[PDB]
Design a protein around this ligand. Sequence first.
Ligand SMILES: Nc1ccn([C@H]2C[C@H](O)[C@@H](COP(=O)(O)O)O2)c(=O)n1
Ligand SMILES: Nc1ccn([C@H]2C[C@H](O)[C@@H](COP(=O)(O)O)O2)c(=O)n1
Ligand SMILES: Nc1ccn([C@H]2C[C@H](O)[C@@H](COP(=O)(O)O)O2)c(=O)n1
Ligand SMILES: Nc1ccn([C@H]2C[C@H](O)[C@@H](COP(=O)(O)O)O2)c(=O)n1
Ligand SMILES: [Mg+2]
Ligand SMILES: [Mg+2]
Ligand SMILES: [Mg+2]
Ligand SMILES: [Mg+2]
Lengths: 114, 114, 113, 113
Amino acid sequence: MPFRFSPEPTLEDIRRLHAEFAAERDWEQFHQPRNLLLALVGEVGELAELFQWKSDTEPGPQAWPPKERAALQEELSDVLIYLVALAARCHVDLPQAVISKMDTNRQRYPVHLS
Amino acid sequence: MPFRFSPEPTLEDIRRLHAEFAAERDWEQFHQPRNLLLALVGEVGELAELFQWKSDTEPGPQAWPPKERAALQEELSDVLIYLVALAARCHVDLPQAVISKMDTNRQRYPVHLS
Amino acid sequence: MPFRFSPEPTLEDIRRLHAEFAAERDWEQFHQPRNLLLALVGEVGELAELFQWKSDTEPGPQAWPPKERAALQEELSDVLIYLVALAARCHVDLPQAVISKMDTNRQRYPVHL
Amino acid sequence: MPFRFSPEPTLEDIRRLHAEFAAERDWEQFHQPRNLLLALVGEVGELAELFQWKSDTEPGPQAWPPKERAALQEELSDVLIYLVALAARCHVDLPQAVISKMDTNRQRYPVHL
Ligand SMILES: Nc1ccn([C@H]2C[C@H](O)[C@@H](COP(=O)(O)O)O2)c(=O)n1
Ligand SMILES: Nc1ccn([C@H]2C[C@H](O)[C@@H](COP(=O)(O)O)O2)c(=O)n1
Ligand SMILES: Nc1ccn([C@H]2C[C@H](O)[C@@H](COP(=O)(O)O)O2)c(=O)n1
Ligand SMILES: Nc1ccn([C@H]2C[C@H](O)[C@@H](COP(=O)(O)O)O2)c(=O)n1
Ligand SMILES: [Mg+2]
Ligand SMILES: [Mg+2]
Ligand SMILES: [Mg+2]
Ligand SMILES: [Mg+2]
């Protein structure tokens, strides 16, 4: 059956949620751009660890066991949360940046040359 | 003045945009989970390169020159695009995964213990 | 007091040690190039975690506390071990590759500029 | 024909070579621990880029074409050079740390299990 994401939360919603979470704990001081970037790298590491010993032939993530699916959800989420936090801290409008990048991607790879 | 993201595109919008982009070029074959993960790692590398030689004291990303701001927008976007693609390819509902992770984050770090 | 690395183990020594370690456990099957690369990325993550919340002003790694020095030693080592394993699995002569790269680095960055 | 690394350069040799390279260009200022770490992450990205679109079935890195072998040598080397630089900047004796980690690895993964 066709797979889709839920319509919410949006990236703005996530930005706002993370900002409130950090503000309640007085963590703004820890959230400088290079801290957030290094935290992002750490979470990408954790995500990679889930895949590192998977063979070419064994079942893919759609079929992993419950505890492994849970970990996968969690690490994908941790990466997104820091990416949002980082983008916001740099005053980058991430949704609109993605539109611009996708337009650039189309120009670099025209369908008739691929 | 207060900074916010635009309300669109949503993560579902980005998922759909990337899927159409890949489908037009017959790239589904290249987009297996471990390919997407390695591409994500590559983009995180490019993002890190923008920050690597910045000193502690010099101005932050909010004040970088136009070409550096453009690169920053682009690499943040490339990371998000592959993260979305990866989540979708694993049938993870990324927005709802983030809600669950944020709830877990609150439980691990109660405000009165921090 | 001048800082230096110890003269051993060499990269070849590390290669041989890791290969024997893996061979004793019948782990050759797990050590394909893309597995090793992803494991390397994981260990780079662990290394980054040690630095992620450090401020500009607090003490630097030369002065970290004992437990943090120990963790730093361990994660730097984990990165090196997988890098060696990956290079060896690809039949790349890593020490000689480094010489070649350093030569190229000199050319790209002339001293007078 | 057995695969081995060359016996030189050693990690100490690489340390000394990189330190002189940086010192000649007055780059000590750029080489703070977190700069070196981020540069390392960048080079791990470049390494990953070489592998990212490879299929399961096409030839593996032992059999890659000449230009791809050259790139692989270079990116493996870039990762090693920054790892050495970072370890040295933190006054970590990387060869001896690796021995300690390998010992710990043996304990965590006993051969009989
Ligand atoms: N200083 C911190 C600590 C945690 N988190 C949030 C974001 C991640 O989703 C998660 C990571 O938590 P941990 O590093 O405890 O696993 O918690 C945060 O934003 N800032
Ligand atoms: N096989 C590919 C090649 C490119 N891209 C898209 C996603 C990134 O935003 C950007 C990366 O392009 P490049 O690797 O050419 O810089 O293009 C993709 O989804 N799949
Ligand atoms: N399949 C494995 C598991 C572990 N290790 C070694 C290399 C690292 O130095 C350390 C990583 O162990 P862990 O992932 O248990 O921390 O042990 C290895 O070579 N291959
Ligand atoms: N500030 C710098 C710039 C370059 N390099 C060296 C280490 C790497 O092997 C290579 C990276 O160069 P580039 O980033 O120009 O590819 O050159 C370095 O040690 N310090
Ligand atoms: Mg995590
Ligand atoms: Mg990019
Ligand atoms: Mg480790
Ligand atoms: Mg490089």
